[PDB]
Amino acid sequence: NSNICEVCNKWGRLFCCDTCPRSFHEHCHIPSVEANKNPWSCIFCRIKTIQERCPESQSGHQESEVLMRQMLPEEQLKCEFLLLKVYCDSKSCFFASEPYYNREGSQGPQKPMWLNKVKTSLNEQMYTRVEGFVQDMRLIFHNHKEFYREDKFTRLGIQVQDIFEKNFRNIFAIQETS
Ligand SMILES: [Zn+2]
Ligand SMILES: [Zn+2]
Ligand SMILES: [Zn+2]
């Protein structure tokens, strides 16, 4: 097993995966690492297992179709994984916790959003469809763009959004296009 957390790349109190070499801090893994369960498999492993059980799940899908899906256990898991993949980029630190807005010549967003609030929302089963989750994720980066304007700090939103979008296309097997 690895000696650093797969998400934050730091050492500390790590829980090791029994079916791959990854390791995680308790609250870096999503969902948070389970009390007992011996053996334990991590979310990477559980996602792999879904694909192997249904190979055709990796054939191309339309985004529109993906977003209307109900949050049954498997979509719940993919959303959790997609969220984890965003937290894996160190730039996610800008979007993690609740923001505030006091910049000359800007007004804050009507509906603030941040990654830990989306994590809580997923944990409390507050999304009934994939659309709910994807909407809040995109809102985070949209709010950032609008607030920071011509400040080059806007690029952080573009960058972390790109991580989200790419992984969203991978995880949910969106049909590739030009
Ligand atoms: Zn960590
Ligand atoms: Zn694993
Ligand atoms: Zn089959």
Short mmCIF file of C-alpha atoms and ligand atoms in Angstrom, two decimals:
data_model
loop_
_atom_site.label_atom_id
_atom_site.label_comp_id
_atom_site.label_asym_id
_atom_site.label_seq_id
_atom_site.Cartn_x
_atom_site.Cartn_y
_atom_site.Cartn_z
CA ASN A 1 0.00 0.00 0.00
CA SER A 2 0.85 3.64 -0.58
CA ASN A 3 2.18 5.78 2.35
CA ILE A 4 0.34 8.96 1.22
CA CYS A 5 -3.37 9.81 0.89
CA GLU A 6 -4.52 9.34 -2.70
CA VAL A 7 -6.60 12.50 -2.60
CA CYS A 8 -4.44 15.07 -0.74
CA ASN A 9 -1.00 13.40 -1.22
CA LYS A 10 -0.14 13.70 2.48
CA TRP A 11 0.90 11.20 5.12
CA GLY A 12 -0.94 10.71 8.46
CA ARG A 13 -3.72 8.37 9.70
CA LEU A 14 -4.33 6.39 6.51
CA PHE A 15 -6.83 3.58 5.78
CA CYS A 16 -5.41 1.18 3.17
CA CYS A 17 -7.51 -0.40 0.40
CA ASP A 18 -7.66 -4.21 0.41
CA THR A 19 -8.02 -4.60 -3.34
CA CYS A 20 -5.64 -1.96 -4.71
CA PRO A 21 -2.63 -0.14 -3.23
CA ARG A 22 -4.37 3.25 -2.51
CA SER A 23 -4.79 4.73 0.93
CA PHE A 24 -6.91 7.52 2.34
CA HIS A 25 -7.42 9.82 5.24
CA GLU A 26 -10.77 9.13 6.82
CA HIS A 27 -12.57 12.19 5.40
CA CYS A 28 -10.55 12.42 2.13
CA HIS A 29 -12.24 9.26 0.87
CA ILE A 30 -15.85 9.69 -0.19
CA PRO A 31 -17.91 8.28 1.40
CA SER A 32 -15.89 8.63 4.65
CA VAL A 33 -14.05 5.45 5.48
CA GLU A 34 -16.36 2.77 6.86
CA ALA A 35 -16.12 1.81 10.57
CA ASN A 36 -15.31 -1.89 10.11
CA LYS A 37 -15.65 -3.88 6.80
CA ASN A 38 -12.77 -6.42 6.50
CA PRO A 39 -11.78 -6.54 3.74
CA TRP A 40 -12.44 -2.95 2.60
CA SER A 41 -12.45 -1.83 -1.04
CA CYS A 42 -12.10 1.87 -1.98
CA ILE A 43 -14.22 3.92 -4.36
CA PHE A 44 -11.75 3.46 -7.22
CA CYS A 45 -12.14 -0.32 -6.77
CA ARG A 46 -15.91 -0.18 -6.42
CA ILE A 47 -16.17 1.90 -9.64
CA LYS A 48 -13.96 -0.55 -11.50
CA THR A 49 -16.18 -3.40 -10.31
CA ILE A 50 -19.32 -1.71 -11.81
CA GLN A 51 -17.64 -1.50 -15.24
CA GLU A 52 -16.46 -5.10 -15.13
CA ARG A 53 -19.94 -6.32 -14.17
CA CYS A 54 -21.54 -4.37 -17.10
CA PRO A 55 -18.92 -3.71 -19.86
CA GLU A 56 -21.53 -2.00 -22.07
CA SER A 57 -21.90 0.70 -19.35
CA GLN A 58 -18.75 2.22 -21.03
CA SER A 59 -20.52 2.70 -24.42
CA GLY A 60 -21.26 6.35 -25.20
CA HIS A 61 -24.23 8.10 -23.56
CA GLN A 62 -25.93 11.48 -24.03
CA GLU A 63 -25.37 14.00 -21.22
CA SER A 64 -29.07 14.82 -21.27
CA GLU A 65 -29.91 11.18 -20.56
CA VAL A 66 -27.27 10.96 -17.77
CA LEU A 67 -28.58 14.02 -15.95
CA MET A 68 -32.19 12.72 -15.72
CA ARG A 69 -31.11 9.50 -14.05
CA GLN A 70 -32.37 8.95 -10.53
CA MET A 71 -29.71 8.71 -7.82
CA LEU A 72 -29.89 4.97 -7.33
CA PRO A 73 -26.86 3.42 -5.55
CA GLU A 74 -24.71 3.26 -8.64
CA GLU A 75 -25.27 6.87 -9.73
CA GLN A 76 -24.79 7.90 -6.10
CA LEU A 77 -21.40 6.19 -6.22
CA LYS A 78 -20.31 7.77 -9.51
CA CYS A 79 -21.25 11.21 -8.27
CA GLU A 80 -19.22 10.53 -5.07
CA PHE A 81 -16.29 9.43 -7.23
CA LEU A 82 -16.62 12.48 -9.51
CA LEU A 83 -16.52 14.68 -6.40
CA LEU A 84 -13.54 12.86 -5.04
CA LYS A 85 -11.69 13.40 -8.34
CA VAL A 86 -12.17 17.16 -8.02
CA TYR A 87 -10.81 17.14 -4.43
CA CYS A 88 -7.75 15.21 -5.81
CA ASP A 89 -6.60 18.39 -7.61
CA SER A 90 -4.87 20.63 -5.11
CA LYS A 91 -6.61 23.68 -6.66
CA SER A 92 -9.87 22.45 -5.18
CA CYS A 93 -8.76 24.11 -1.91
CA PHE A 94 -10.17 27.36 -3.39
CA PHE A 95 -13.63 25.84 -3.71
CA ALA A 96 -13.75 23.59 -0.63
CA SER A 97 -15.14 25.70 2.16
CA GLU A 98 -17.80 28.38 2.30
CA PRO A 99 -16.72 31.54 0.49
CA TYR A 100 -17.34 35.20 1.14
CA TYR A 101 -17.72 38.11 -1.23
CA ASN A 102 -16.45 41.63 -0.63
CA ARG A 103 -14.66 42.93 -3.72
CA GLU A 104 -14.84 46.52 -4.99
CA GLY A 105 -16.93 46.58 -8.19
CA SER A 106 -18.45 43.10 -7.69
CA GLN A 107 -21.51 41.70 -5.99
CA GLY A 108 -21.62 38.15 -4.61
CA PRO A 109 -23.62 35.26 -6.20
CA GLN A 110 -27.34 34.78 -5.43
CA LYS A 111 -26.65 31.12 -4.55
CA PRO A 112 -23.23 30.42 -3.10
CA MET A 113 -21.90 26.85 -3.47
CA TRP A 114 -18.84 25.03 -2.33
CA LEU A 115 -17.42 21.50 -2.46
CA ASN A 116 -18.01 20.53 1.22
CA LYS A 117 -21.65 21.59 0.91
CA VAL A 118 -21.98 19.34 -2.12
CA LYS A 119 -20.22 16.58 -0.07
CA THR A 120 -22.78 17.02 2.73
CA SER A 121 -25.64 17.11 0.27
CA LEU A 122 -24.47 13.75 -1.20
CA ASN A 123 -23.99 12.27 2.23
CA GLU A 124 -27.51 13.33 3.35
CA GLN A 125 -29.07 11.98 0.11
CA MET A 126 -30.41 15.38 -0.86
CA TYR A 127 -30.07 14.83 -4.64
CA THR A 128 -32.79 12.80 -6.38
CA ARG A 129 -31.10 12.97 -9.77
CA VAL A 130 -27.64 13.28 -11.22
CA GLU A 131 -28.75 16.69 -12.59
CA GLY A 132 -28.95 18.03 -8.99
CA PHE A 133 -25.37 17.18 -8.26
CA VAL A 134 -23.90 18.34 -11.66
CA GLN A 135 -25.87 21.65 -11.35
CA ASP A 136 -24.34 22.50 -7.98
CA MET A 137 -20.84 21.48 -9.14
CA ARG A 138 -21.10 23.75 -12.23
CA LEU A 139 -22.57 26.53 -10.10
CA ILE A 140 -19.37 26.63 -8.03
CA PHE A 141 -17.27 27.45 -11.05
CA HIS A 142 -19.88 29.72 -12.61
CA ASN A 143 -20.15 31.80 -9.43
CA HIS A 144 -16.35 32.11 -9.34
CA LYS A 145 -16.19 33.32 -12.97
CA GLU A 146 -18.83 35.94 -12.49
CA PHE A 147 -17.41 37.35 -9.23
CA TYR A 148 -13.74 37.60 -10.19
CA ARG A 149 -14.38 39.04 -13.61
CA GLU A 150 -11.14 40.26 -15.27
CA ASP A 151 -8.99 39.33 -12.32
CA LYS A 152 -6.78 36.51 -13.55
CA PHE A 153 -7.94 34.62 -10.44
CA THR A 154 -10.90 33.65 -12.66
CA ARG A 155 -8.63 31.12 -14.32
CA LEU A 156 -8.77 28.89 -11.16
CA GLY A 157 -12.45 28.34 -11.84
CA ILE A 158 -11.76 27.46 -15.47
CA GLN A 159 -9.03 25.05 -14.43
CA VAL A 160 -10.93 23.15 -11.74
CA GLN A 161 -14.02 23.07 -13.98
CA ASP A 162 -11.96 21.37 -16.65
CA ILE A 163 -11.00 18.69 -14.13
CA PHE A 164 -14.69 18.23 -13.24
CA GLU A 165 -15.87 18.08 -16.86
CA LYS A 166 -13.21 15.66 -18.07
CA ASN A 167 -13.92 13.28 -15.17
CA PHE A 168 -17.62 13.67 -15.63
CA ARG A 169 -17.24 12.54 -19.28
CA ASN A 170 -15.05 9.55 -18.20
CA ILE A 171 -17.07 8.39 -15.22
CA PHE A 172 -20.44 8.55 -16.95
CA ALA A 173 -19.13 7.47 -20.38
CA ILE A 174 -20.39 10.48 -22.29
CA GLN A 175 -20.29 9.88 -26.09
CA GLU A 176 -17.10 11.40 -27.44
CA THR A 177 -17.56 14.27 -29.98
CA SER A 178 -15.56 17.02 -31.76
ZN ZN B 1 -6.02 13.02 2.40
ZN ZN B 2 -8.97 0.21 -4.01
ZN ZN B 3 -24.03 -8.09 -18.49
#
